[PDB]
Write a protein that binds this ligand. Structure first.
Ligand SMILES: O=c1[nH]cnc2c1ncn2[C@@H]1O[C@H](COP(=O)(O)O)[C@@H](O)[C@H]1O
Ligand SMILES: O=c1[nH]cnc2c1ncn2[C@@H]1O[C@H](COP(=O)(O)O)[C@@H](O)[C@H]1O
Ligand SMILES: O=c1[nH]cnc2c1ncn2[C@@H]1O[C@H](COP(=O)(O)O)[C@@H](O)[C@H]1O
Ligand SMILES: O=c1[nH]cnc2c1ncn2[C@@H]1O[C@H](COP(=O)(O)O)[C@@H](O)[C@H]1O
Ligand SMILES: O=c1[nH]cnc2c1ncn2[C@@H]1O[C@H](COP(=O)(O)O)[C@@H](O)[C@H]1O
Ligand SMILES: O=c1[nH]cnc2c1ncn2[C@@H]1O[C@H](COP(=O)(O)O)[C@@H](O)[C@H]1O
Lengths: 460, 460, 460
């Protein structure tokens, strides 16, 4: 990184403390920028979904991986659930998305509830595998909430075979009342849907795929119990990337856990965290990890900072941790505090190869939580932390532990009425990051870190 | 202390200005950390209750000392009341707590008011020293306000002899409708009570006891009048610790007072304050004090700072006074401005041997003040400062002095509906400090100050 | 009817205008009063549910008929739905009620929604016709709304075979924690449920049953089209009583409708309405009707009165119409304006053999409408009128009808948090009516009309 002459403050820098100075550029268009990563994750955009049960669901895994991102499944998920989730994600089409499906015998109440699990705005009525109609929220309005789907389903819809050029599907939906094109398998059964906006993303985002052409997906593992056996079985389940996650990554028990996984030679990229120091970053890489997760109490007003006083501003942490990782051939992930595309761009300029986002993505249609409404009828979803699942660990013992546990904090994450889907947030984030590179003169993320010039601003 | 490279700001730092950078750690469990102090106070935890009439009651002394703490009785308290208080605290069982007691002829009005004197959630009805029933807030609801305790008491309760293993008492109380175990003397009379959570606390917190195994106790004394006679009168009354307390500790009249008490050779630790300068710590220890209490106008917008402009940020004050005290083999107490476990952890990292807590603990069941409710019906208590009792001191004379006196400031300290008792606040504080040491890599408090690495953060 | 001396006002009387003067009575208990009717309807309580789609569902038909009432199915309801509704009611147990049933694959969202269709407070989980557990509203709280019933169902429940007397079932639920007893057929299949309150009503209410011992049910028909052909189809479907209903019962088109139904000799009671005059009542009986439905715009400020000014106070209408029916051997139903048990008691004293209740019964669990919540989160239901389905009836023609047609008026019917089920409303009504007879000195409804002494009160 480069700072303006004299910009060496006597403190650490948060995302709000720094700004990017424009430089000489020959990159005119945002589309000329290549957002592919070089950390072995296989992502085409520098966005990683945090390993939190409030965010890392099956629909989020499919939706994010299709647009070039990756979702890390939360640690301690039962291996049966991991296998079914991986099999679901790696069976999805690289262009066609999975819609909400309904049976003719389902109620209107279920139809309205189950609909808001995707950003398509319409559900496909299925009878013996075949699409027979579409259900919208307008079809559910003004009708008996326990009526059957058959009574409100619209039998007319735009259809096209799977494999059709998305530009042609875009044409078929130009004068369509419902912006959903139902894609059919050769035998006529349901294969998925494609919207006009979804077809656009097909030509803008490159799907993150493994060697077999299947959508990528990652999964997390804690440092208690048998780390080797769990990470081994997690690799057997089809995970394309393994993340060893703990609150204090710079500890001997985390150091030992990385040695156990590395000694198995699983052939998967290894992330380890969290640390905010150069020494801790070097220690995790020497243990056998190739990627380091950066982020320990980034919020001055958050739980970790106010309970213990331990933490570090995320921007200064990444700058120090990335430089330590760069000389060892490693990479760093910026984990925590991401609320705007600015934080994604600033984290990458500081040296990160990927940016991990948690609570921000919880307020989306694709997150596992249920869609809620506040006193003003504004849509929102509840994010919450992993609490003891990132901590080192008979009625007495449980209660003895229970006294000193970390509580589960819940936060109101409002849904943007114009950006309700996680794909809209990916459009929001990547548009800013691409335009950031045009300001600095970078055609990719490596040139971003190389040519970025940074400055410090006052509290004004 | 060590600061991050370049973190030498051009100003003094308060608790909000600094953060703790994690280091390599082999301390996995919070319970592996030793919170014992080395300043001679006899505490196994770094929490001191301030010498304030709003906080320093008799029930406060019993409850805090059992969990390893120490309570300083407010100065100028009559010597008769001091003796009565000492005899209570040193007559208590190291595990069994003193419950609220009720007579069968008492009113429901009294029972409801007396119930909130402890955090047990139930009061034991006593007849001729014998427990005959329990009274809860549920028994007081919906009944006549002037009905007798006899009419609402629950005659069924779990009982066990005093001295029984607290691990046993815990399992006896699972299927009891009231989570209060009534402990009995050999002759069947009331000895105290023990809750499920209180039974767990017996195996987590070590009682702060004197050489005879009696709960420890402190004492404060002003600098007006005969300091030697007052210090001796409280020492013979059973105090294990003496606090010479005033607003401006760096004064010649203060030095005379410490020399007067030290020349008595009472054999007890001498605490003296308050100063926030390196010279102030040197002069007070040279006078004969072993512990220097640090804290003068720590709040920028508090009364002392707004009236005189005199003060100093508490963290920079402590770290300077801690550095000076070490060179003379003394210790320092961080007194003032503590509102979160972060403040306790940073005070210890800065070099203080103990953290003095006052107004924060006023909003607890164990504080002497009355439980009040706001316009939202939420519980709170009124904390207030000592005013002139920490200041050096015909009818014309009475008026002129009273005219310039510092007024009593009142502040509302809300009770946490989940942490209504002071023991819950001690759980909150120690959990953070224990977690802090695991982040720093220290197994005890001296190692905390030795291994801590801190940084400065911006206003963002 | 007898009025006090001088109580001959120069106007007609509503239910608010009159009162009952107590008389000498030897009827001590409410249980000594016989509420059975003599009008041929077969009801054992003087309560009939109006032919309104807002109230006349199958859950209401079963619940009211079991307690001695009868429900009139709304006119123009398809004949296929008639047979399905009648066959359901005619197959219900005279003591055992039909609970809400759930599949282990049903969602918690559907479980909470379906719960409010009965007053049992719990739904029975069914697999292949056999009960496996119950789901309560408490079971749905705090869990994911898309969790499965199988994950929250309680496997423990009191069960008893069908045919057990309600007294012993009452005892089995005395110390059962949740007041639902599952009734099973001899083969172990689900026969229904019986609650402690439902067991009590079995000894209080006599079910209204046909000659085969099956619950009674009535149905309404309009005077448009082929009234005779429709009326025969309703009789063949199993209806026990037919109601020929129109807005203006005193018209030639209504008279021809009665003759058509009478000439078919269906063997059922013939109800005709609506009129509010002695001549109108006598004309309908001469046409072939045995029961005349009384009620034309009884509300002073209702829609009918405000559009046309046509109507009559219901109490004076019933008095005049009943006396006219008495001389011709007929009976009258009080239809409209019923809001309290007072209206039922006053209608019977005025000479009506039955009281028709509509919008009041809409705010019940058993009504067909879905349970709603207002801005204060209070439960309520929407009542609404029959509009053109009670009125005499190309594109230009259809538009002319809609232009001058009567709109559908909607009204919010709040649920009593203590009287949520329609059986509680029947308990509220019959308690007052039985108490009314004890004040008058009547052992039955004929004695009520025979011994009643009435008075008029002013607006005070
Ligand atoms: O399109 C759909 N049709 C039917 N059930 C669905 C659909 N999407 C999600 N579900 C159900 O919703 C629940 C939770 O789904 P998740 O939140 O996507 O994991 C499970 O019971 C799923 O079967
Ligand atoms: O319970 C918790 N307490 C504190 N930090 C947490 C907890 N659960 C997850 N985290 C961290 O916070 C990150 C998400 O931060 P976010 O992107 O600001 O929501 C995760 O990736 C974890 O590193
Ligand atoms: O357990 C108890 N039973 C009855 N009175 C009590 C109890 N604890 C305190 N009190 C009374 O409460 C008042 C103040 O007590 P303090 O707040 O402990 O100083 C005095 O009148 C005490 O006698
Ligand atoms: O009236 C007063 N004015 C100023 N400082 C006071 C007063 N009373 C007590 N103090 C100091 O404030 C400390 C308590 O600080 P707290 O815990 O932040 O309320 C005490 O231990 C005293 O050192
Ligand atoms: O116990 C029940 N289980 C499941 N669905 C029910 C139950 N009772 C009523 N319904 C549904 O309610 C609707 C009929 O409404 P109704 O005619 O008012 O009872 C249909 O969608 C039924 O499947
Ligand atoms: O749309 C309508 N307009 C006017 N009267 C109606 C309508 N629907 C039903 N009614 C009458 O009102 C009665 C119910 O009155 P309630 O018991 O006071 O609600 C029914 O039995 C009908 O006689």
């Amino acid at each position: 990184v480069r700072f303006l002459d004299g910009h060496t403050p006597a403190y650490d820098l948060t995302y709000n403390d720094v700004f990017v100075v424009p430089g000489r550029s020959d990159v005119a268009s945002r589309f000329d920028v290549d957002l592919s990563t070089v950390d072995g994750s296989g992502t085409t955009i520098p966005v990683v979904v945090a390993n939190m049960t409030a965010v890392a669901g099956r629909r989020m895994a499919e939706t994010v991986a299709r647009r070039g991102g990756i979702v890390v499944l939360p640690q301690d998920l039962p291996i049966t659930a991991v296998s079914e989730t991986v099999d679901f994600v790696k069976s999805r089409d690289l262009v066609v998305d999975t819609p909400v499906t309904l049976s003719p015998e389902d109620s209107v109440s279920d139809a309205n509830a189950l609909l808001h699990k995707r950003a398509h705005g319409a559900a496909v009525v299925v009878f013996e595998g075949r699409p027979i109609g579409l259900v919208t929220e307008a079809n559910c309005a003004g009708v008996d909430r326990f009526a059957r789907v058959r009574d409100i389903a619209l039998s007319d819809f735009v259809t096209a075979p799977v494999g059709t050029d998305p530009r042609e599907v875009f044409d078929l939906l130009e004068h369509a009342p419902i912006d959903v094109a139902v894609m059919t398998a050769p035998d006529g059964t349901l294969a998925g849907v494609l919207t006009r906006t979804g077809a656009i993303r097909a030509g803008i985002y490159t799907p993150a795929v493994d060697a077999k052409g299947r959508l990528r997906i990652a999964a997390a593992v804690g440092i208690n119990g048998d780390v080797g056996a769990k990470a081994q079985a997690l690799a057997e389940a089809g995970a394309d990337l393994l993340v060893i996650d703990t609150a204090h990554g710079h500890q001997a028990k985390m150091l030992d856990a990385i040695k156990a996984v590395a000694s198995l030679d699983l052939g998967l990229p290894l992330v380890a965290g969290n640390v905010v120091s150069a020494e801790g970053t070097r220690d995790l890489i020497e243990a056998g990890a190739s990627i380091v997760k950066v982020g320990v109490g980034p919020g001055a007003m958050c739980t970790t900072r106010m309970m213990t006083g331990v933490g570090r501003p995320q921007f200064s942490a990444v700058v120090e941790c990335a430089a330590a990782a760069r000389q060892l051939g490693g990479h760093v992930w910026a984990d925590g505090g991401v609320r705007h595309p600015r934080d994604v761009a600033l984290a990458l300029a500081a040296g990160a190869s990927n940016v991990m986002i948690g609570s921000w993505f919880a307020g989306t249609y694709e997150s596992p939580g249920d869609l809620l409404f506040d006193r003003d009828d504004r849509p929102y979803k509840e994010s919450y932390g992993m609490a003891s699942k990132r901590a080192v660990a008979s009625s007495f013992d449980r209660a003895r532990k229970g006294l000193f546990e970390e509580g589960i904090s819940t936060s109101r994450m409002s849904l943007d009425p114009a950006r309700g889907g996680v794909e809209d947030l990916l459009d929001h984030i990547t548009s800013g990051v691409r335009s950031t590179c045009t300001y600095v003169g970078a055609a990719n993320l490596p040139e971003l870190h190389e040519k970025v010039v940074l400055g410090v601003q006052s509290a004004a």
